[PDB]
Design a protein around this ligand. Structure first.
Ligand SMILES: CC(=O)O[C@H]1C(=O)[C@@]2(C)[C@H]([C@H](OC(=O)c3ccccc3)[C@]3(O)C[C@H](OC(=O)[C@H](O)[C@@H](NC(=O)c4ccccc4)c4ccccc4)C(C)=C1C3(C)C)[C@]1(OC(C)=O)CO[C@@H]1C[C@@H]2O
Ligand SMILES: Nc1nc2c(ncn2[C@@H]2O[C@H](COP(=O)(O)OP(=O)(O)OP(=O)(O)O)[C@@H](O)[C@H]2O)c(=O)[nH]1
Ligand SMILES: Nc1nc2c(ncn2[C@@H]2O[C@H](COP(=O)(O)OP(=O)(O)O)[C@@H](O)[C@H]2O)c(=O)[nH]1
Ligand SMILES: [Mg+2]
Lengths: 290, 437, 187, 436, 62
């Protein structure tokens, strides 16, 4: 389908400059200049956060009214009576709350140490990749997971480099890609677990490119649906109801509600004769597209 | 028809099955000799759900005790209601498990599975119409966790159409009796998710707290803990055993409760519960029962329903009572506390009534609730698991049984997928526009 | 409405290309969405409606009830893409006798069952883009043995991509159709 | 000569089976032994029991009913209750496994293996009849057995007889009170199936009968045993013209033609009057005029529909006891002058009245009182479509996320059968609106 | 029917008086569909409906 390398910069500029929209607030702790290597934080991304609700704010259950009511107010000496007197929802869970995405990936660390054969190619008519060596002779087992682990990034030029890396390696991969699948599930799941729209819309297009990059990749991926579909089930019904308003935004890929539908159709297309039930098990709303 | 076979795995399960079978034998009025000494034919009409008739007019449980370290098997044989078991239905290993899921599931499991499977088949033939299997575990130790999951995997492929219960005791959030407790819990929840049909979860802390506050006990023992467990395990099958104007088969009790195939971790409590003092004066009415069961205390596990929303709930009453009262009490609770119930379910409680009250009571009621607050237990368990596995402590043991670490990672990922399921369904409204904005 | 107008060769009720295509249509969405996107096969705009629960996401042709779409052209033709999902549409008809029949066609149905006021019938959609033509006057004669007078309401449910809805007054061929009233699928 | 076949399906089907057959055996003096006392014969006429019974070669009267179920735990109770000498054990049918609140199991998985059994019984049960008026199906729309099987049976009956008349006294899911959570599904799945196969379908609800029990009978402790007594009171009043004398007899055929205007509108309401206790019964005259007022009272309905939001397409009035035809004519005429009671313009008529000289019976130890006048009303109102809209909402509410669907599709069903059944309701709703 | 414009008739003012003008040939029409329609317009009194209806039947009967 459409590429993911070019669209990203123009989108970010259109969003931040043209509209009054926010970046919004990408944490850049530990990262200084382009020269000093960052201090990788021990935290992990897409991590479920504990419940912060207080002790007492929890309402108590009244045995007499069958209702959760808030506790009464303890007296206070300042608030004493004077002469005149004539007179609970539960704490919501962060289902759609963007998890914290620290810059402590492995791609950033490897690129900082300078072990990658990539570089930006400004001599092209746009941002392109420039390889120090030949792609089709690389060790995919060592490099391909590293490149997937940089998809979660948001700081330039790391995310551009990472997306363009996987985009170019999947084209020339061929058979060298199939045995690497068991090592790609963790970074894919970690990128999806961030709840952030930018990384999610990127990884879904990369996942499409992944199933299309070679043959027999579909059946090989099928056993791993239980670890990548759980997020699909959330944003499957995040669409825009414009009515008569034509969607100019359709020029680029931003609507998850159908970026997920296309990807699920593609999974059922390539998975074989049993991918449909493994999909229907995770996302129940799905409908067979054959 | 509607026969049921019972398993007790691990030390905890083999001990609590003792109390379960004592309570059932008392219900149906039989002596630890195996001889029936009741009064009515109501103790014999549907006795065949749990027992086998023997020569000389005696009744023997349809239970299978499986446990390494046969000290517990000799304990249950010494116990008062031990003489009723077929000694053939006793599968033990001479070695121990050392609280190690790896050897409980991989090395020492594969040596006893053949025997336990021959036993289960020999006695599953004896059933006219087998309803399902029920088992009792303890997710903390090795024997229970590993061998129960191994036998569940075997049973699921040998009898897929049948249905399976698991009355599992879960790790404790504040007490750490064993140190490898989170490993043993996660490596077993990963197996439960695909091969169980109903999974009740019970916790010693909430058991203690119930017994201390409500029952006013001064020194709770595992005896009283298993007394509570057996009360609940018995109240489950009242519709199969005794008549009821609104029966509730075990299968219609799962169909009406689990909406999605993965959300089968329930949460139970018992009513009435009181001390000898207020027994003399508390009137026993459907209102009292339904106002005690809906509390956040009677939940035998340590998950506060205040943090979530009830997907479904169920209340099985027993005793000659007015069903309009039950119906309207459930309706009025749903109406009052409407925010703690999901919206895409119009009415989300089931109410079942049996005519036969307990032996010493006039009315009782058992509660089940598939609340979205259960996700906090898995969150805590995964937090502990990943605080410890991050440093790779106590892993040489689990690797010694041929295990590797991708199994740990897979189990953790599946736990997180299940807590995400719970979170999504905790706030998906009936109308999609409010979720994504 | 559409009374005392002129219908002789064609009558287009809906067209994705325009400043506002849902001029007369009422739209009701519950768990779905309506928009206008550029299709890939037919490289132009198509008005798509989708969503779960087919029976709830639809669009009615007259803006409001108690207002009829008086149209006397026999043939009715839709241009729809087949998304391999549950798609259905309904058309109400006035017979020669003052009785309002209604026929509906569903792709998730397998048997036709004539009833006093309703006639459900299956539809065997093709793959991708296709135009479907209803006689709508043979249907009334074949079902209730009466004559067609004039359509009253049209309604199209979810999981489809509409491009053209038009009454034809006769079965025109691919040649006789004008440029706008045909399927020109480019390369 | 004038015989019917009474089929009871599911739990509530055979629960009221314990109520109807308690009443009929009590109506005709039959003791639970199936014999007559033969020394204190009370039946003023002979050969009236043949409507519901089959005299054997010598002395015994066996009911021509059929108790059907997949749960043994209730059918065995009948085999132990006092009413065990009555039924031929071939009639009591049971299964080892239950449908477990699942239309698919009651329809696709389990039912298809015992229908041959039940149908063979019905053959043997109809062959002894010489004139069969029609079947009388008791169902509980909302369960796996009642909906799954009841649907599966009626098809098998229609293909066999078709020309025979079939009635359905199906209890219906209440708006507020609900003893299940998945009853929206199997209810919808049931209607789409019974519709083309039932000829008439009376409808009543549990919750509405609770209030009739509250206001009138003033009972604080209602139970299914209290309600089932009322259903027996209706059908006794309904079938009286079959097995009793009286002016203006009404057969089943005569009853269905003038009450179903269009081939699908047949869901009808019900109401009984008077319904009182002993002490009130004897400080009162119970005039024919004040009874027919309580009948058309909205509170006395047995379903949670308000008929004052719609119009009456027809009304049938089965009077029972000491009633003269002049008073019916003078009291029905009173209500036509009333303003609250609307009638669609296309019926200047609207009343099929029936009188019986046989007063209603009371069960010793019951809750009703003995009276000399009683009115049971069956009306076909166009407002009934509102209760058909609640399900159109609840079904649509959960079918979005497709909750509990993995069960139905797991037991030999497809998602098509869901939206297939969904149309027939939305198609039915406007059918209730086209008549406006 | 005339309002909806389904009839092949028109007034022929080019004649020496009011005459009928047929869009098609009369002797090949479907009498079953048209002839009752033309009789049903005899009851009319508003011009030009009654003239058209009377002239329609008058010419079709010949
Ligand atoms: C004289 C009398 O009846 O007194 C009661 C009594 O006062 C209370 C307090 C009982 C009593 O229970 C306790 O004191 C207790 C102590 C520790 C843990 C749990 C309970 C009782 O032991 C419990 C016992 O319950 C039964 O007998 C039930 O049939 C019960 N049976 C057993 O658990 C059982 C135990 C050992 C051997 C055989 C049976 C049962 C419950 C569920 C399912 C089947 C059976 C009864 C009513 C009483 C006493 C004796 C005081 C209570 O227990 C139950 C289960 O009813 C505790 O709160 C309830 C309310 C009872 O009213
Ligand atoms: N009026 C009345 N309603 C009853 C009675 N018993 C049950 N019901 C209602 O019937 C509904 C349940 O129907 P069931 O008959 O139990 O279900 P089923 O058709 O047998 O299918 P399974 O449950 O799988 O056996 C509930 O809503 C009950 O409230 C009764 O005795 N009288
Ligand atoms: N309710 C109850 N819980 C028990 C009992 N005995 C042990 N437990 C718990 O069971 C846990 C130990 O697990 P265990 O079964 O002994 O190890 P395993 O044999 O390898 O499965 C501990 O958390 C104990 O607290 C008992 O008698 N009653
Ligand atoms: Mg039932």
């Amino acid at each position: 389908n459409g590429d993911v390398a070019g669209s990203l910069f123009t989108s970010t500029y259109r969003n931040v400059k043209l509209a009054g929209k926010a970046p919004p607030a990408a944490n850049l702790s530990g990262t200084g200049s382009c020269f000093d290597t960052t201090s990788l934080s021990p935290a992990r991304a897409g991590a479920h956060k504990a419940l912060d609700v207080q002790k007492d704010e929890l309402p108590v259950w009244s045995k007499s009214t069958l209702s959760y009511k808030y506790p009464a107010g303890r007296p206070n000496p300042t608030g004493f009576l004077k002469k005149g007197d004539g007179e609970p929802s539960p704490p919501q869970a962060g289902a759609y709350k963007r998890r914290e995405n620290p810059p402590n990936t492995a791609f950033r660390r490897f690129y900082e140490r300078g072990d990658l054969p990539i570089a930006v190619d400004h001599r092209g008519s746009k941002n392109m990749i420039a390889w120090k060596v030949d792609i089709e002779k690389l060790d995919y087992h060592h490099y391909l997971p590293i490149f997937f682990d940089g998809i979660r990034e948001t700081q330039e030029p790391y995310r551009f480099l990472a997306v363009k890396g996987v985009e170019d390696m999947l084209r020339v991969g061929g058979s060298k890609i199939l045995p690497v699948i068991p090592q790609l599930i963790i970074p894919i799941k970690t990128a999806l677990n961030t709840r952030d729209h930018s990384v999610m819309c990127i990884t879904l297009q990369l996942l499409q490119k992944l199933v299309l990059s070679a043959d027999l990749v579909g059946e090989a991926l099928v056993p791993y649906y239980r670890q990548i579909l759980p997020i699909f089930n959330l944003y499957k019904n995040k669409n825009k109801n414009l009515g008569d308003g034509i969607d100019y935004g359709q020029r680029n890929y931003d609507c998850l509600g159908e970026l997920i539908a296309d990807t699920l159709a593609l999974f059922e297309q390539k998975g074989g004769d049993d991918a449909f039930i493994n999909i229907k098990y995770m996302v129940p709303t799905y409908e067979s597209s054959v | 028809m509607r026969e049921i076979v019972h398993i007790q795995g691990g030390q905890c399960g083999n001990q609590i099955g003792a109390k379960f079978w004592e309570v059932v034998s008392d219900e149906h009025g039989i002596d630890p000799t195996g001889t029936y000494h009741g009064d009515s034919d109501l103790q014999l009409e549907r006795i065949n759900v749990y027992f086998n008739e023997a020569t000389g007019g005696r009744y023997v449980p349809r239970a299978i005790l499986m446990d390494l370290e046969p000290g517990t098997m000799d304990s249950v044989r010494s116990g008062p209601y031990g003489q009723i078991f077929r000694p053939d239905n006793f599968v033990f290993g001479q070695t121990g498990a050392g609280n190690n899921w790896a050897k409980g599931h991989y090395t020492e499991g594969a040596e006893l599975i053949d025997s336990v499977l021959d036993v289960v088949r020999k006695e599953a033939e004896s059933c006219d119409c087998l309803q399902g299997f029920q088992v009792c575990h303890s997710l903390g130790g090795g024997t229970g966790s590993g061998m129960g999951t191994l036998l569940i995997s075997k049973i699921r492929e040998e009898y897929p159409d049948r249905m399976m219960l698991t009355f599992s005791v879960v790790p404790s959030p504040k007490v750490s009796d064993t140190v490898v407790e989170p490993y043993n819990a996660t490596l077993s929840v990963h197996q439960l998710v695909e091969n169980a049909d109903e999974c009740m979860v019970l916790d010693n802390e909430a058991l203690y707290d119930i017994c201390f506050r409500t029952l006013k006990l001064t020194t709770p023992t595992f005896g009283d803990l298993n007394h509570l467990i057996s009360a609940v395990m018995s109240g489950i099958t009242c519709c199969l055993r005794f008549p009821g104007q609104l029966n509730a088969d075990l299968r219609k009790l799962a169909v009406n409760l689990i909406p999605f195939p993965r959300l089968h971790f329930f949460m139970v409590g018992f009513t009435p519960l009181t001390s000898r003092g207020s027994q003399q004066y508390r009137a026993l009415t459907v209102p009292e029962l339904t106002q005690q069961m809906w509390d956040a205390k009677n939940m035998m596990c340590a998950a506060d329903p205040r943090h979530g929303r009830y997907l479904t709930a169920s209340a099985l009453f027993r005793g000659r009572m007015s069903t309009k009262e039950v119906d309207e009490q459930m309706l009025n609770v749903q109406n009052k506390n409407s925010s703690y119930f999901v919206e895409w379910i119009p009415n989300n409680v089931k109410s079942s009534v049996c005519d036969i009250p307990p032996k010493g009571l006039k009315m009782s009621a058992t509660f089940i609730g598939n609340s979205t607050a259960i996700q906090e237990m898995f969150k805590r368990v995964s937090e502990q698991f990943t605080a410890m596995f991050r440093r790779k402590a106590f892993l040489h043991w689990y690797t010694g049984e041929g295990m590797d670490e991708m199994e740990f990672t897979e189990a953790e990922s599946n736990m997180n997928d299940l807590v995400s399921e719970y979170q999504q369904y905790q706030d998906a409204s009936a109308e999609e526009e409010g979720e994504f904005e | 409405m559409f009374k005392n107008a002129f219908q002789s060769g064609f009558l287009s009720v809906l067209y994705s290309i325009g400043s506002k295509p849902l001029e007369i249509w009422d739209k009701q969405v519950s768990n779905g969405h309506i928009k206008r996107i550029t299709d890939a096969d037919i490289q132009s705009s198509v008005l798509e409606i989708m969503g779960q629960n087919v029976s709830t996401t639809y669009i009615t042709c007259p803006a409001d009830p108690n207002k009829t779409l008086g149209i006397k052209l026999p043939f009715l033709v839709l241009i729809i893409k087949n998304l391999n999902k549950y798609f259905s549409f309904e058309v109400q008809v006035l017979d020669d006798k003052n009785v309002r029949r209604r026929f509906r066609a569903s792709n998730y149905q397998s048997t036709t069952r004539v009833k006093p006021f309703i006639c459900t019938m299956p539809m065997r959609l093709d793959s991708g883009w296709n135009q479907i033509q209803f006689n709508l006057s043979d249907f009334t004669r074949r079902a209730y043995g009466t004559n067609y007078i004039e359509t009253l309401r049209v309604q199209v449910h979810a999981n489809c991509r509409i491009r053209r809805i038009y009454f034809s007054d006769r079965l025109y061929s691919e040649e006789e159709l004008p440029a706008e009233f045909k399927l020109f699928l480019p390369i | 000569m004038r015989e019917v076949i009474s089929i009871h399906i599911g739990q509530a089907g055979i629960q009221v089976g314990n109520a109807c057959w308690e009443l009929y055996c009590l109506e005709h003096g039959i003791q639970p032994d199936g014999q007559m006392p033969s020394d204190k014969t009370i039946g003023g006429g002979d050969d009236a029991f043949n409507t519901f019974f089959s005299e054997t070669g010598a002395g015994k009267h066996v009911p021509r009913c059929i108790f059907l179920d997949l749960e043994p735990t209730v059918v065995d109770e009948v085999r132990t209750g006092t009413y065990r000498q009555l039924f031929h054990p071939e009639q009591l049918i049971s299964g080892k496994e239950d449908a477990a609140n699942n239309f698919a199991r009651g329809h696709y998985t389990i039912g298809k293996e015992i229908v041959d059994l039940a149908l063979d019984r019905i053959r043997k049960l109809a062959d002894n009849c010489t004139g069969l008026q029609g079947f009388l199906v008791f169902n509980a729309v909302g369960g796996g057995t009642g909906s799954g099987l009841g649907s599966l049976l009626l098809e098998r009956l229609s293909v066999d007889y078709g020309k025979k008349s079939k009635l359905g006294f199906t209890v219906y899911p209440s708006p507020q009170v609900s003893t299940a959570v998945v009853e929206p599904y199997n209810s919808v799945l049931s209607t789409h199936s019974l519709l083309e196969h039932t000829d008439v379908a009376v409808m009543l609800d549990n919750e509405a009968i609770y209030d009739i029990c509250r206001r009138s009978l003033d009972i604080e402790r209602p139970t299914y045993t209290n309600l089932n007594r009322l259903i027996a009171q209706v059908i006794s009043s309904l079938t009286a013209s079959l097995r009793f004398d009286g002016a203006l007899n009404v057969d089943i055929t005569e009853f269905q033609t003038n009450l179903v205007p269009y081939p699908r509108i047949h869901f009808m309401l019900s109401s009984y009057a008077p319904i009182i206790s002993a002490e009130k019964a004897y400080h009162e005259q119970l005039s024919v005029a004040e009874i027919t007022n309580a009948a058309f009272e909205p509170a006395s309905m047995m379903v949670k529909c308000d008929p004052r939001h719609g119009k009456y397409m027809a009304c049938c009035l089965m009077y029972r006891g000491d009633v003269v035809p002049k008073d019916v004519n003078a009291s029905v005429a009173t209500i036509k002058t009333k303003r609250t009671i609307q009638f669609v313009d296309w019926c200047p008529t609207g009343f099929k009245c029936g009188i019986n000289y046989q007063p209603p019976t009371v069960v010793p130890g019951g809750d009703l009182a003995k009276v000399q006048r009683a009115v049971c009303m069956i009306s076909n109102s166009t407002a009934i479509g509102e209760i058909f809209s609640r399900l159109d909402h609840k079904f649509d509410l959960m079918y979005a996320k497709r909750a509990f669907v993995h069960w139905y599709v797991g037991e030999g069903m497809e998602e098509g059968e869901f939206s297939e059944a969904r149309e027939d309701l939305a198609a039915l709703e406007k059918d209730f609106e086209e008549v406006g």
